[PDB]
């Protein structure tokens, strides 16, 4: 069972404060593990999976974000990004703190979530589900 749904209470171009988030989705689990695994799908900076600067949709601006590193834990997540915080938890809605500080250049940004919650590892016996949820979240700036 999984349910990754983002929600941007604020559109965009409203002058992003150095941190002020935007999209706070939520992950849901129910299996043996110690972490929630989520992503943004917006490539990656340096190579972490936690706090990582995302780009827009018209390739001309970046929209900083914070989430997989509030207090989460860096986990081996396909596609560079992907970190987990306590997961065994039934569900944790993670907020994405836009590390702005001034104003986020006009245009549109697209952010795709995907908090699987489960992390496959070298185990004796167990099924197979290496896909994890998927979600969108675009910031319309004008």
CATH at 130: 2.60.40.1570
Give counts: helices (H), strands (E), the chain: 0, 11
Angle made by CA atoms 22, 94, 29, in degrees to the nearest 5: 145
Tell me the C-alpha distance between 118 and 28, whole Å: 9
Contact 67, 94 (CB under 8 A): yes
Structure tokens at 94: 């993670």
Secondary structure class of 130 (helix, strand, coil)? coil
Beta-carbon contacts of 77 under 8 Å, excluding residues fewer than 6 positions away, are: 37, 39, 49, 83, 84
Tell me the C-alpha distance between 39 and 44, whole Å: 10
Contact 104, 139 (CB under 8 A): yes
The Cβ-side half-sphere exposure at 132, using a 13 Å CA radius, reads: 25
Q: What are the residues facing 36 on neighbouring strands?
A: 85
Chain mean position to CA 49: 9
Tell me the C-alpha distance between 88 and 130, whole Å: 18
Q: How many residues does the chain have?
A: 142
Contact 43, 111 (CB under 8 A): no
The Cβ-side half-sphere exposure at 27, using a 13 Å CA radius, reads: 30
Range of the domain at 29: 1-142
Q: CA torsion angle for 83, 85, 88, 92 (degrees, to 10)?
A: -100
Tell me the C-alpha distance between 84 and 101, whole Å: 27
Contact 81, 29 (CB under 8 A): no
Chain mean position to CA 47: 14
Question: Torsions phi, psi of 69, nearest 5?
Answer: -145, 15
Beta-carbon contacts of 14 under 8 Å, excluding residues fewer than 6 positions away, are: none
Tell me the C-alpha distance between 74 and 25, whole Å: 19
User: What was the structure determination method?
Assistant: NMR
Residue that is written with structure tokens 């939520």 in the block: 26
Please give the tally of structural domains in the chain: 1
């Amino acid at each position: 069972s999984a349910e990754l749904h983002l929600e941007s209470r604020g559109g965009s171009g409203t002058q992003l404060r150095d941190g002020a988030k935007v999209a706070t989705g939520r992950i849901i689990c129910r299996e043996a593990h110690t972490g929630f695994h989520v992503w943004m799908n917006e490539r990656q900076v340096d190579g972490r999976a936690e706090r990582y600067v995302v780009q827009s949709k018209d390739g001309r601006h970046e929209l900083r974000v914070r989430t997989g590193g509030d207090g989460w834990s860096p986990v081996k997540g396909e596609g560079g990004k992907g970190v987990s915080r306590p997961g065994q938890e039934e569900q944790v809605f993670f907020d994405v703190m836009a590390d702005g500080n001034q104003d986020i250049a006009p245009g549109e940004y697209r952010f795709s979530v995907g908090g699987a919650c489960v992390v496959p590892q070298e185990d004796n016996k167990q099924g197979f589900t290496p896909s994890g949820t998927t979600g969108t979240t675009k910031l319309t700036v004008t």
